[PDB]
Every structure is written in structure tokens, then in C-alpha cells.
Design a binder for this molecule. Structure first.
Ligand code: HEM
Length: 197
């Protein structure tokens, strides 16, 4: 139950994802990051109670009923990430809201919410962060930077402008989410087993 214990689990799961991700991602630095992030999310979703095997089958209204569990998952993601990386040592509650938006966007897209509407729902989810905070958290995601490297020189991204960035890079972000989905599911299943021992 301790965060250190969840981090050790996520680190072990990341080691099982990494060789397979390397078979298909030629940037090995990006492969290392993907394997840690997908492992951390798999653990966080499992211990937050997001039913990911049901999400991939769910309707949009069923995904929206689960919205508070995604926010809990984001807080656990950011706490684990502090142990494994150190870097997210700051306002944890703000970082948690940002990362929460990631899996919740993907959950709405998986459920069949049209990409542009899902993007607006993300804009809604980020309200309360300053455009400067939004810019700084977006710059910490290697998938967003890989799809939209102009993030690297934005000082200010409003929630609406963040949704516009997702839409402008829809095809690239769909390809990264499709790459990550099988590894997220594998990590979630391994987490559920390891947590339940
Ligand atoms: C579309 C596919 C996405 C993939 C494959 C992905 C992958 C990742 C990975 C691997 C990390 C951790 C990096 C590391 O450990 O070095 C990460 C971090 C992050 N991602 Fe993304 N992400 C995606 C979409 C998004 C979206 C839509 C958001 C919207 C807010 C988002 C927000 C973040 C944030 C804030 C972090 C920082 C984590 C922290 O500081 O604790 N991601 N992402």
C-alpha cells in the first residue's frame, strides 16, 4: 500500500514491457520512458479501481460515470513518479490533475467519443490550472512532445488551446495511443496480480 511498494511493482512491470517496446520503437530513450510511464499508469489504474478491462468495452456514459476514479489514478501516478524519477517534486495536486487528463482522454476516445469532443472534455478537465502550468506539464509528457514539439517553446497554453493542439496532431496521438494500449493492459493485469498477492 505504501507508495514505495507501488513504485517497486511498477519498476518490475516496466522491465517486462521494455524488451517488447524496443522491438518497435527505434528511439530507445523514448522506449525506456514509455515502459516506465505505461507501467506506472497500469499500477495506478489498478490500485485506484479503474476497471480497465471494462473501459475498453464501455459506452461513453459508462466511462463518464468512472471519471472520479481517473482523478484518483492521476494522484497515484504522480506520487509513484516522484519515487521512480524524482522530478515531479512540486504541486502534486496540480500535476495529478494534468496526468489524470491523459488516461481519461484515452478512455473517452476508446469508448467512441469523437476525437474533437473528447479533446474539449480534456479542456474542461484542466480548468483551474494557469496556462503557464498547463504548458509546463505538457512539456513533461514525451508523447505530447513527440507528436507536437512546438510545446517545447510554448510558455502559455490555455485549456482551449491545449484541446486545439490535440486536434491538430490527432493522427500522431492516435498512433502513440494505439502503440501504448496493449502494454497498458498488460501492465494493469500484472499490477492486479502483484497487488493482490
Ligand atoms: C497519447 C498517448 C500518451 C502516451 C503514450 C503518454 C505517455 C507518457 C509517458 C510514458 C509519461 C512518463 C514519462 C517518463 O516517465 O519519463 C507521461 C507523462 C505525462 N503525460 Fe503523457 N502520454 C500520452 C498522452 C497524454 C495526454 C493527452 C496528456 C494530457 C494531459 C498527458 C499528460 C502527461 C503528463 C502531465 C505527464 C507528466 C507525469 C508527471 O509529471 O508525473 N499524456 N506520458
Amino acid at each position: 500500500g505504501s507508495i514505495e511498494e507501488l513504485a517497486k511493482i511498477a519498476k518490475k512491470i516496466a522491465e517486462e514491457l521494455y524488451p517488447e517496446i524496443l522491438k518497435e520503437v527505434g528511439d530507445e530513450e523514448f522506449a525506456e520512458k514509455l515502459s516506465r510511464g505505461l507501467a506506472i499508469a497500469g499500477v495506478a489504474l489498478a490500485v485506484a479501481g479503474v476497471p480497465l478491462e471494462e473501459i475498453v468495452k464501455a459506452s461513453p456514459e459508462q466511462v463518464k460515470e468512472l471519471e472520479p476514479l481517473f482523478e484518483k489514478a492521476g494522484r497515484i501516478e504522480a506520487q509513484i513518479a516522484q519515487v521512480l524519477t524524482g522530478e515531479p517534486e512540486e504541486d502534486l495536486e496540480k500535476a495529478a490533475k494534468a496526468v489524470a487528463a491523459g488516461a481519461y482522454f484515452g478512455a473517452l476516445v476508446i469508448a467512441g467519443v469523437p476525437f474533437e469532443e473528447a479533446a474539449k472534455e480534456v479542456a474542461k478537465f484542466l480548468e483551474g490550472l494557469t496556462p503557464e502550468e498547463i504548458a509546463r506539464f505538457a512539456q513533461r509528457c514525451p508523447a505530447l512532445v513527440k507528436a507536437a514539439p512546438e510545446i517545447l517553446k510554448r510558455d502559455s497554453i490555455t485549456p482551449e488551446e491545449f484541446a486545439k493542439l490535440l486536434i491538430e496532431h490527432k493522427e500522431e496521438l492516435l498512433e502513440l495511443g494505439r502503440l501504448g494500449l496493449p502494454y497498458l493492459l498488460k501492465a494493469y493485469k500484472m499490477a492486479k496480480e502483484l497487488l493482490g498477492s
